[PDB]
Amino acid sequence: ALNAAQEKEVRALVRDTLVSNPEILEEAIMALQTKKADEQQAQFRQALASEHDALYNDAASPRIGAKDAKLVLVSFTDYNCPYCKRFDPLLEKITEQYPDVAVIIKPLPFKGESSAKASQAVLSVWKEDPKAFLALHQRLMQKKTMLDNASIEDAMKSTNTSKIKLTDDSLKTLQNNLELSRKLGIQGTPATVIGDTILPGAVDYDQLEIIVKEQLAKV
Amino acid sequence: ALNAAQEKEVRALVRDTLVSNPEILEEAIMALQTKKADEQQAQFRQALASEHDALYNDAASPRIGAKDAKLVLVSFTDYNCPYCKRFDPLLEKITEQYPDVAVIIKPLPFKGESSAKASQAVLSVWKEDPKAFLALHQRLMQKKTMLDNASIEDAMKSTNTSKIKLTDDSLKTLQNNLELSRKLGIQGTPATVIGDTILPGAVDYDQLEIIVKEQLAKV
Amino acid sequence: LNAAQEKEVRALVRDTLVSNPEILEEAIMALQTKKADEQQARQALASEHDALYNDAASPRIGAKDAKLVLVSFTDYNCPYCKRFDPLLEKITEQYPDVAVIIKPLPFKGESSAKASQAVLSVWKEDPKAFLALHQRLMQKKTMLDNASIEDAMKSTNTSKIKLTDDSLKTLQNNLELSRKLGIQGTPATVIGDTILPGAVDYDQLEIIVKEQLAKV
């Protein structure tokens, strides 16, 4: 053992050490990144059921894939999130390889104004010209640099959506995405809803393919 | 209480433990998501506790399944609700496949006049002749268009309950269900209490099996 | 100290966190403000001068006394990074006055963090072997996994080198760095006072390097 008083001082040092040096946390996160484990969460079934219509029946939420689809994934993502930029082509590839599968995008504004603006832009484009959304979506994901208004205008120009107005209705959609994320325990991106579980972060295509196939099976 | 060299060393052992063993972090994350999920559900669970006798001990509320079941679902349903019609067979299937599980029906007058009349009919049947309840319950639930005077009467004719009087007392039980739905936050049908969670809509058999199995284990 | 007590501290770290998730929620909050403190889209590369150019743990391709040092933020699993790396190398080959520092990033997932651990670990212990492993991992056309990484390290005489936990500290520093410079994707190359935001034609790259080299 060790002094019953020393025990409680170690417990406090665990708290003070982590909160004061978040690089410790971020390195621990880096360490967890090297472990190939899907960290699927089932803590939120009730909340997912309770929010079914907000997840899957919101016409303002862009869709990649078939409206006909048998399985719909919900991607909570941020156009400025580096892991998001890399995880999205995997999600896209699922819909290409499994046409029975579609992905609903829920953009989030976590990394600031330009995230909010990009979110606004794609949501607006989706509402006015659904078929032009995917190109703009991809173009934003390809930006290697922190977005700003200039680089968003460029993305819209090179994807012929520059003439589409960013609307106020789209911001209501964005605030829904946010409150919805709040309720599903989603505090980081990318988070992916696949049936009853949430995939709290990005995974390898191999792991994603298996998870889709298992849920695509259940229906 | 603890020297400076050991404070210095407990602090360094925080970083090392977490970075060397990311699994600790993963546990801590799950623990947190569980905390979140539980806190978001606390109001609902308090209500479930407060309305326990109205939920589980009202002899006027019909039951499908063993009176001594280990687990009792509570189905808030409406005979004119088309999703209730798709879902009810799944709830029945659970009692068929899992004899330790029973379902209590809470009929609701949500969709209109014939919803109140249909609820009154099955509640009235249940109390006079419980054995005769289920065939009528099934029959009304099978009807595809909204019920009216004639189809409720035909439903009772084909299930030999036509000669059972629809009581005023049966309406006390109906009003009780309304009260119960308000206090539990049930603002639509179907809704199912399963242990300490509530399914707020129709879900496929598999997803319902998983919740029932899980809640059955915790007993 | 005291090896027995040290065992308990380790188990306390786990039990304290798992039994009180609120500590983790504070810590994430603390991390949030950290990421806020850093994020920023002729600005921040200047502040981050020592991080950029004087990290011993950061691998270098080219002369140690080079007059121009490009900084390559890159990912071993990123196809555009795989195609662009040979071009940055060719620059050092054709312009021995130009060196390239490598900042591996984990953006494309679990193998990217491992590939990054391997090269940073090899650079600390066996710097002579870094370049061979770097090109090897960059020349694989499939997603890295544990097998192809081990296979790549055998081929380059580095299979006896442990992938350290300390190299993750460096990998997290690269994450910090890219936040402060507004680098959200790969490849991205720092050249003088400007950041080249993707894969470009060699001819284009050459022109920019040649001008910055003359600015010195």
In chain A, where the domains are located: 4-218
Question: What is the Cα–Cα distance from A127 to A188, expressed in whole angstroms?
Answer: 26
Q: Which residues of B touch A (CB under 8 A)?
A: 1-2, 6-7, 10-11, 14-15, 18-20, 22-23, 25-26, 29-30, 33-34, 36-37, 40-41, 197-201, 203-204, 206-207, 210-211
Do the Cβ atoms of A187 and A198 come closer than 8 Å? no
Residue listed under structure tokens 């894969």: C199
In chain B, which residue's Cα lies nearest the Cα of A197?
B207
How close B107 comes to chain A (CA, Å)?
Answer: 20
Q: Do B5 and C1 touch (CB under 8 A)?
A: yes
Contacts of B7 in chain C (CB under 8 A): none
Instruction: Determine the topology of domain C44-215 in CATH.
Output: Glutaredoxin (3.40.30)
CATH topology of domain A4-218: Glutaredoxin (3.40.30)
Task: Phi first, then psi: give them for residue C201, nearest 5 degrees.
Answer: -65, 145
What angle (nearest 5°) sits at the alpha carbon of residue B112, between those of residues B108 and B116? 45
Distance from C-alpha of C111 to C-alpha of B88, rounded to nearest angstrom: 47
Report the chain A residue with the minimal C-alpha distance to residue B185. A50
> What's the token pair of residue B83?
């999703």
Element (H, E) at C195: strand C194-196
Dist CA A218 CA B203 (whole Å): 12
Beta-carbon separation of C24 and B24 below 8 A: no
Query: Nearest CB to A196: which of B23, B41, B207?
Result: B207
Q: In this structure, are residues A166 and A117 in contact, taking their beta carbons and an 8 Å threshold?
A: yes
Per CB-CB distance under 8 Å, the chain B contacts of C16 are none
Beta-bridged to residue C189, according to DSSP, are C72, C196
Give the resolution to one decimal, in Å.
2.6
First-to-final CA distance of chain B: 45
And the tokens for A10? 């170690």
Q: Considering only CB atoms, which chain C residues are within 8 Å of A80? A: 184
Q: Convert chain B into a string of H (helix), E (strand) and C (coil).
A: CCCHHHHHHHHHHHHHHHHHCHHHHHHHHHHHHHHHHHHHCHHHHHHHHHCHHHHHCCCCCCEECCCCCCEEEEEEECCCCHHHHHHHHHHHHHHHHCCCEEEEEEECCCCCHHHHHHHHHHHHHHHHCHHHHHHHHHHHHHCCCCCCHHHHHHHHHHCCCCCCCCCCHHHHHHHHHHHHHHHCCCCCCCEEEECCEEECCCCCHHHHHHHHHHHHHCC
Nearest CA of chain A to the CA of B52: how many Å?
20
Nearest CA in chain A to B20: A31
User: Which H or E element spans position C35?
Assistant: helix C21-38
Give domain B51-218's CATH number out of 3.40.30.10, 3.20.20.30, 3.40.50.360, 3.40.50.2300.
Answer: 3.40.30.10
Residues of C in contact with B14 (CB under 8 A): 13
Instruction: To the nearest 10°, report the CA torsion of A15, A18, A21, A26.
Output: -170
CB pairs under 8 A between A and C: 130
Provide, as residue numbers in chain C, all residues whose Cβ is less than 8 Å from the Cβ of A34. Answer: 110, 113-114, 117, 168
Put simply, the answer to whether A218 touches B204 (Cβ < 8 Å) is yes
Note whether B207 contacts A218, CB cutoff 8 Å: yes
Say how far apart CA A76 and CA A192 lie, in whole Å.
6
Cα three-residue angle B133-B138-B143, rounded to 5 degrees:
130
